């Protein structure tokens, strides 16, 4: 086509979706990771994660307001990944990289799994 | 912070949100523009438009599944703007610029209003 494109549009949209999350506006699911609870928007979760895409395209699970993750999942790892979904920024540290990579494999977030593998390889 | 950032994340999220729209997955509102109907995600509309942000933060309107726009709004202009919300690309043409600018003013989409004003000024 002959469209023009606003370079910052996608980043500005994501910033506004994170502001809605902050302010608990139109959040429609609670993700439970053992004793912790995280409120989010199903569409953002599906857009970032192959696991959430599969969950919320299921004709029964699409209607659930609570999703319980596998008890082996680390709440801090999940929190770091949820923040990445809404901001593009990943708080990857020596002390959390193993939990973050394991969580990203479970959530099916291939680009995160990729940077974790590279950071681990560099320290070996 | 000491975060790393994935450059393409925001664009990839927006591409996936447009794929959900295409496939009518988790759309939660119908926008009526006279005889036409457009299905969308409230959160994407709020993230792009000051008018939708105000509508869906209202304690009563947040719960509506149908929103009727002012009868003066052009359906093609709305369609072009809805596509822009989900893709960052604006199909601005000599034949639609007046309707697109009027619709963007109504929807409170300041960057679109800005490029329309500039394109109009250049032809004068």
């Amino acid at each position: 086509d002959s469209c023009i494109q606003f370079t910052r549009h996608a980043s500005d949209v994501l910033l506004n979706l994170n502001r809605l999350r902050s302010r608990d506006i139109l959040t429609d699911v609670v993700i439970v990771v053992s004793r912790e609870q995280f409120r989010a928007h199903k569409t953002v979760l599906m857009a970032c994660s192959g696991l959430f895409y599969s969950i919320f395209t299921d004709q029964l699970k699409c209607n659930l307001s609570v999703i319980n993750l596998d008890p082996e999942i680390n709440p801090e790892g999940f929190c770091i990944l949820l923040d990445f979904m809404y901001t593009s920024r990943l708080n990857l540290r020596e002390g959390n990289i193993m939990a973050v990579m394991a969580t990203a494999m479970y959530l099916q977030m291939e680009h995160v799994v990729d940077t974790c593998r590279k950071f681990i390889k560099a320290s070996e | 912070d000491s975060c790393i950032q994935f450059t393409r994340h925001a664009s990839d999220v927006l591409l996936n949100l447009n794929r959900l729209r295409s496939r009518d997955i988790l759309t939660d509102v119908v926008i009526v523009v006279s005889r036409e109907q457009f299905r969308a995600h409230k959160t994407v509309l709020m993230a792009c438009s000051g008018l939708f942000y105000s509508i869906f933060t209202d304690q009563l309107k947040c719960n509506l599944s149908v929103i009727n726009l002012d009868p003066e709004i052009n359906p093609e202009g709305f369609c072009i703007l809805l596509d822009f919300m989900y893709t960052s690309r604006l199909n601005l043409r000599e034949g639609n610029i007046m309707a697109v600018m009027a619709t963007a003013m109504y929807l409170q989409m300041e960057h679109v209003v800005d490029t329309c004003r500039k394109f109009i000024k250049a032809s004068e």
Binding site: I4, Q5, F6, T7 | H111
Partner: peptide, 4 residues
Amino acid sequence: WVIP
């Protein structure tokens, strides 16, 4: 705004 750019030509994509």
